[PDB]
Design a protein around this ligand. Structure first.
Ligand SMILES: *[C@H](O)[C@H](C[C@@H]1CCNC1=O)NC(=O)[C@H](CC(C)C)NC(=O)OCc1ccccc1
Ligand SMILES: *[C@H](O)[C@H](C[C@@H]1CCNC1=O)NC(=O)[C@H](CC(C)C)NC(=O)OCc1ccccc1
Lengths: 306, 306
């Protein structure tokens, strides 16, 4: 029993974190096979970050301006290119520890583990969600750039995130590992808006299901509702519209629990209109939306490796 | 910026998790050098767990009744003993991946990372605190026993917890790695009370300091207080008495922030007497107590490896 914000075991991605230095800036880089991925703003100086002409800065750079080291071992750089906002550094040595891996562009509402690094060395793992507005509520100090987000499936690391910047609101933004930002962001030290952040309704329901599974059942109603009437309630409260594949995705949880999805939505509507009245659900006084249905099932089922 | 429940990188302890089987029961075990530590109730059968005579069950056991495997590799057992509630299985092979390690008995209020395992394979990491009442609010399904809790310092793994059982309240109990339970617990399938759980006051303050550091400053008062008068407030609300080495431990946070500790206590007294009025602190509507002062400093400072 019990439900926790659980990150993936980080051992596979640990052996992939390197230090990438270019002049005074040091960032983290991801060493897979014989290429090192890192945020391209490693090539920026003190001033360049207001509005960098990245191709023009990269031209001033040669292979030997890129100090990359894995722990103590310095790797020789035999090639560099820029793919979108990511620098790809070809190195002579294949990482002896590259795991089976995929690059994937995750979708909003999906979660992933972040291995927060500084100076190529790991300092912590936590779980977070790609918000609907394509930001993450992370914990990133200076030098954390190039820290990566990932999922594990069997022995397969699925890298989906590389950290680039902090916004004015204090949330975080970053790219997929092909260097394309999630969201409308650009890697400049400029004021950039994220949109309104909506709540991931299907995740909240999955967390209500985990709550029922774990004994928290006070919020269970005697009511029901309809997709459309709940969806009018969702829009009042900046909740993403619940759709028919959402109820289908909750199917396993609905069956394992014997609570129809729309009975759960009607429970959620009451929580949204009457608050929690100072009660708690799974040790929280807020509605939690960083648990996907798969997170719940994996945790309430104990799926290993992954 | 940002503050998250961060676990330690789990790579070092991953390479130490094995499967230990004895008849029908399978648990996780910790393979360090040529010994495998695992909960002694691996030797229990269906019925034995109501009130096991553990020495009498262990006598029926020989070295070859202990199937331990690391991934696919089965290790030969060359010796077994029982130290308190832990079985020590001597194996012929030293783990080629044992990290620098210590066994430590952590104190209440301290935190640690848990690597939740099933069948000797890791499935997730999360952070939790040894409650004042010596339980943990974990996430542990069947087969999770032998999962371990740990801290990292430089390259040094400090193992402090091994999971044994779930209580009626759904919290979790376990031993240090010398097999002595934290708390008044015994490894029987019996109804066992933990005490009232008090809130770790010094941790709540450290989290208020992290909140100020991260921009959340609405709760800051114009009041002050005294250790004794706050401590009368703490006792009303099941908060552990704040002591003089507690304010001294908060010293670095008090200095880095310019908020006297007793000004913070007076802010905490107001939160305790007037609630949060539907506001949030660091994305939470509850007062959080699973962050020690060192957790805050490490996170607000970015300390690596550890
Ligand atoms: C990469 O190490 C860094 C991560 C920031 C630093 C503090 N917290 C973070 O998430 N990213 C940047 O410094 C980025 C540089 C651009 C050229 C992409 N600028 C940025 O994020 O500005 C916001 C900021 C806030 C607080 C301190 C420094 C920068
Ligand atoms: C070890 O794998 C297991 C962990 C329990 C199982 C479910 N959640 C847990 O934390 N520990 C035990 O099964 C323990 C056996 C005693 C001989 C130590 N008994 C126990 O914890 O009883 C409570 C329980 C609750 C729900 C399912 C099974 C047992």
């Amino acid at each position: 029993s019990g439900f926790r914000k659980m990150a993936f075991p980080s051992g596979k991605v640990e052996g992939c974190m390197v230090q990438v230095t270019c002049g005074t800036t040091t960032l983290n880089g991801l060493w897979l096979d014989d290429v090192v991925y890192c945020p391209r703003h490693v090539i920026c100086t003190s001033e360049d970050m207001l509005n960098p002409n990245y191709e023009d800065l990269l031209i001033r750079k040669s292979n030997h301006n890129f100090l990359v080291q894995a722990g103590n071992v310095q790797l020789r750089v035999i090639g560099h290119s820029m793919q979108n906002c990511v620098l790809k550094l070809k190195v002579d040595t294949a990482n002896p520890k590259t795991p089976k891996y995929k690059f994937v562009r995750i979708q909003p509402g999906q979660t992933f583990s972040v291995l927060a690094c500084y100076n190529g060395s790991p300092s912590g793992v936590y779980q977070c969600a790609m918000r609907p507005n394509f930001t993450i509520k992370g914990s990133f100090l200076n030098g954390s750039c190039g820290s990566v987000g990932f999922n594990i499936d069997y022995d397969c690391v699925s890298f989906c995130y590389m950290h680039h910047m902090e916004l004015p609101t204090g949330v975080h933004a970053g790219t997929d590992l092909e260097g394309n930002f999630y969201g409308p962001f650009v890697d400049r030290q400029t004021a950039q808006a994220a949109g309104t952040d909506t709540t991931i309704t299907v995740n909240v329901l999955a967390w209500l299901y985990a709550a029922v599974i774990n004994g928290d059942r006070w919020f269970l109603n005697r009511f029901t509702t309809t997709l459309n009437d709940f969806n009018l309630v969702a829009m009042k409260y900046n909740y993403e519209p619940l759709t028919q594949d959402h109820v289908d995705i909750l199917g396993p949880l609905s069956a394992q629990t014997g609570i129809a999805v729309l009975d759960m939505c009607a429970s959620l509507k009451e929580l949204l209109q009457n608050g929690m009245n100072g009660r708690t659900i799974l040790g929280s006084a807020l509605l939690e939306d960083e648990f996907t249905p798969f997170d719940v099932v994996r945790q309430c089922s104990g799926v290993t490796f992954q």
